[PDB]
Write a protein that binds this ligand. Sequence first.
Ligand SMILES: [Cl-]
Ligand SMILES: [Cl-]
Lengths: 180, 160
Amino acid sequence: MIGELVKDKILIKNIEDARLIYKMGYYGKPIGISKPKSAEEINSELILSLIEGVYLVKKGKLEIVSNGERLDFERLYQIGVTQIPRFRILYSVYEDLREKGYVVRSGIKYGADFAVYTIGPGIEHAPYLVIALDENSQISSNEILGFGRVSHSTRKELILGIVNLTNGKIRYIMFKWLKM
Amino acid sequence: MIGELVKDKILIKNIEDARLIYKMGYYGKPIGSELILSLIEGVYLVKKGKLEIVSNGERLDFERLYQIGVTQIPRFRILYSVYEDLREKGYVVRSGIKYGADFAVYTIGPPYLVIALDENSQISSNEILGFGRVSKELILGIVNLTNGKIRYIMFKWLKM
Ligand SMILES: [Cl-]
Ligand SMILES: [Cl-]
């Protein structure tokens, strides 16, 4: 498994490698398709985000190169910090959730950071929406109101992933828009 | 029902009146007896026509009492908005300070802790899960000072 760093994303040019990385656990998105039922229908280069790439590298399931240079975890992580806003808190939740066995996808279509899934041999579940947060970052009422808006929009489960960048621990707090 | 304004609180000197106001729906706290009502409770009861208030001769109506609340009590506007809305919805609303919140709401349907907030407020992620009773639930009372509408959002400390 080898991938090319191109800006803020990682390109998987080999289709076999692509289909394999995707089979592993629904990583990346193929170019031109939105979301493949199976890796079987993937025929275009697999595109991985830095968050996904950095995870896979750390998992030893992927090597990354940037025009000759071989970027390891320390370097890739650092690039994520520079390129991607909120990279630290986003990777912390991505990793933690991924490490716990959930299948983590982008949650932007739903107005959140991630779309977390519980899957297994012949088992698919509804997507939990997670929004990563820096425990200290001050949230406004307008943002908090924006939260409870994305929640009862696709009426799924909205969840805040509060990360401590020091100890790396994570506190998950879910909230619903109530109708007192 | 007549009550005296004494600073930021309202005194109910008559014990019958006291016991009645308390029977109504658990309003005020006795000094255990004179029933002591907070401006938030007093202003509500006045508006409900269930209580008259006096301040050394002067008869204070809703407009004046409300204004006094604004002057005396910090966050009075957002606190009364949630108090009233919740009370108007039939919940029994008590102080929630013992629990580190504004109110302790009791449902008479099928204590919830609520913290009233203004649309311009800014709470940290660790102020939230921080304290109330979280690390159970804590309900956020988000108030729009313009239209006076209120959005309630509850959140729990999860264990993913
Ligand atoms: Cl992603
Ligand atoms: Cl009260």
